[PDB]
């Protein structure tokens, strides 16, 4: 199905569809940390003294995991904490047909979480009986239990994030309110209010479609906008593979910890995999040799886990830097970058909070219902050559019109919408036609 090319026909779209495309990016990962000594030497002084001969290996590993855990707070701050003031949407939804109830918070819900973030939090689930959950039981929501709770799980510990899921949802609500009430202006300055139909009209004028297109099709565009967001909920529910990037992060971290703990069951060439038996069954001199084999194996296991987390944390940081760029350029502005903020011409985007991630709903303009018209580069009228100021010359078969590129709005060829340069003998493909002059009928009286 190739596109037929000819040197004098142009296909111009006579219609459009507004569409919404969902984008999901990870932002952070669970702030887990692992104590070197409690992992290698479980409540054991003989193992601790032998480990001291290895120098800074424990303290180096603790610094590495602590650094990763602090990067996670930075990632979340860089993405969501962009909004400086907590703006709020008006209680009345007289936006001119545009229904944002699917993305705005619900007062009826127990949490100020929108009906799309409700599906997002109910669809991203961590592993069943995973240490991330199991740690929540011995901790009992009491900070004082951390030392005892960490002792049970071989030194593994999970740290609470500096921004809770409730605070992160609050920031997206401010981002959403600012966008609907002030357009671009809350990202660059004070929040200059503007009616939403006029705001949307300037999104149209940005992609190169005149603003009168919106005001004359305002009801149809609002219906297209509402139906597109309505399809998002069904698309997310009926497809549980849409949150694969967020689950991938959670699964990779869970599989790392599970393997790290199971390494404690390996003998590593010693006489037994349990330190208590080596110390209670064997001669006191004969124990150091067996413990060294365990220490070497367990220290190498921890080093492997730490390096993997370092590489993976860098990968998530790259995704978090991208989410912050998409927040500024897709949500707080209108991007001219073609596939950055969705496919089609970018109109606007809406951030939605997700577990350790963000979801962007990119509203874009897609041309539809193309028709082919004969075209010419210029017009000969009085020996002079006339070029369109904006748009293209098209012919419906007998008459010539000038129309905008991205929508079929034909207009009479006039001195107002054309400019003159050169003469007829230079331009290749020039055509003879009349050019209307608004002053002549006034002088015709």
């Amino acid at each position, epitope marked *: 199905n190739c596109v037929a090319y000819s040197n004098n026909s142009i296909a111009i779209p006579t219609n459009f569809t507004i569409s919404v495309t969902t984008e999901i990016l990870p932002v952070s990962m669970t702030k887990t940390s692992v104590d070197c000594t409690m992992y290698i030497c479980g409540d054991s002084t003989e193992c601790s003294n032998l480990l001291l001969q290895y120098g800074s290996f424990c303290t180096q590993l603790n610094r590495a995991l602590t650094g990763i855990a602090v990067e996670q707070d930075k990632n979340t701050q860089e993405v969501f904490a962009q909004v400086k003031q907590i703006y709020c949407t008006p209680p009345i939804k007289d936006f001119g047909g545009f229904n944002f109830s699917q993305i705005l918070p619900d007062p009826s819900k127990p949490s100020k979480r929108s009906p799309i973030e409700d599906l997002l939090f109910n669809k991203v689930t961590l592993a069943d009986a995973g240490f991330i959950k199991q740690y929540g039981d011995c901790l009992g929501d009491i900070a004082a239990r951390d030392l005892i709770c960490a002792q049970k799980f071989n030194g593994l510990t999970v740290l609470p994030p500096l921004l809770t899921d409730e605070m992160i949802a609050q920031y997206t609500s401010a981002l959403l309110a600012g966008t609907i009430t002030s357009g671009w202006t809350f990202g660059a300055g004070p929040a200059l209010q503007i009616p939403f139909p006029m705001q949307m009209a300037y999104r149209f004028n940005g992609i190169g479609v005149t603003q009168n297109v919106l005001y004359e099709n305002q009801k149809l565009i609002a219906n297209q906008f509402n139906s597109a967001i309505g399809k998002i909920q069904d698309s997310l529910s009926s497809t549980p593979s849409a949150l694969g990037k967020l689950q991938d992060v959670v699964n990779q971290n869970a599989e790392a910890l599970n393997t790290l703990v199971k390494q404690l069951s390996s*003998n590593f*060439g*010693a*006489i*037994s995999s349990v330190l208590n038996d080596i110390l*209670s*069954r*064997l*001669d006191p001199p*004969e124990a150091e*040799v*067996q413990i060294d*084999r365990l220490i070497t194996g367990r220290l190498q296991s921890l080093q492997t886990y730490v390096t993997q987390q370092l590489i993976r944390a860098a990968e998530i940081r790259a995704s978090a830097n991208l989410a912050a760029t998409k927040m500024s350029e897709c949500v707080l502005g209108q991007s001219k970058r073609v596939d950055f903020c969705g496919k089609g011409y970018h109109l606007m985007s809406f951030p939605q909070s997700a577990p350790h991630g963000v979801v962007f709903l990119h509203v874009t303009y897609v041309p539809a219902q193309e028709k082919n018209f004969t075209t010419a580069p210029a017009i000969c009228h009085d020996g002079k050559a006339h070029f369109p100021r904006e748009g293209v010359f098209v012919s419906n078969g007998t008459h010539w019109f000038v129309t905008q590129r991205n929508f079929y709005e034909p207009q009479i060829i006039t001195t107002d919408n054309t400019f003159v340069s050169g003469n007829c003998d230079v331009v290749i493909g020039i055509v003879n036609n009349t050019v209307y002059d608004p002053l002549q009928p006034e002088l015709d009286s």
Partner: antibody
Amino acid sequence: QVQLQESGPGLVKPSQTLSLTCTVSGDSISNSSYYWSWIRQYPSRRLEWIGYIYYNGRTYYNPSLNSRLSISLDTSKNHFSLKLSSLTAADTALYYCARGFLGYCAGGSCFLNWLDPWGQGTLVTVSS
Amino acid sequence: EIIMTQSPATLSVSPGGRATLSCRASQSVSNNLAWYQQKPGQTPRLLIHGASTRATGIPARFSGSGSGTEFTLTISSLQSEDFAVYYCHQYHNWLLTFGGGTKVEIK
């Protein structure tokens, strides 16, 4: 199966050296699966472990009599021996030689298993 | 050392009855226990090894149980020849040690 037979002087003067020999038939003392031990039994039915030697010659002794004791093996004749010095009247007991099974071994150390069988046992009297 | 205490120093059981013998360790000896039978003037015979694995050729009436610290040997049908001294023994630690022995008298 294996059979163990003790031999030694039944009457030894105090402050003399006791020498016991346990000849092993049906097995080689160099078999990697065994350790060979000495246990003495008192008239009060009390059993006391004296010491054992691995097939490769590694010896472990009871600290209660560590400074008086040595155990050795001879691969030519398949027997292991006990030498107990500084004998007192408290050393009068019934000395058994027994074959133990070695357990899991790694890195030059072994866990123990049970003793089976015991030798017939030789009675040693320490008196003038 | 792991001191091993056998609770009944002597036990009088009617023929055909049931005898229960207990052995207590000072610290966990795990499953590393054995029970030895010494008939009067004879060599000790291994009855049970591990916690409860009966040795080959031992009547099914001899049953051992326990783990960690408390262990129990039970004789299910006291024949006339089961009169002996029964020793528990631990091979958990190096420096293996024996209990005091229970003399199972028969009425």
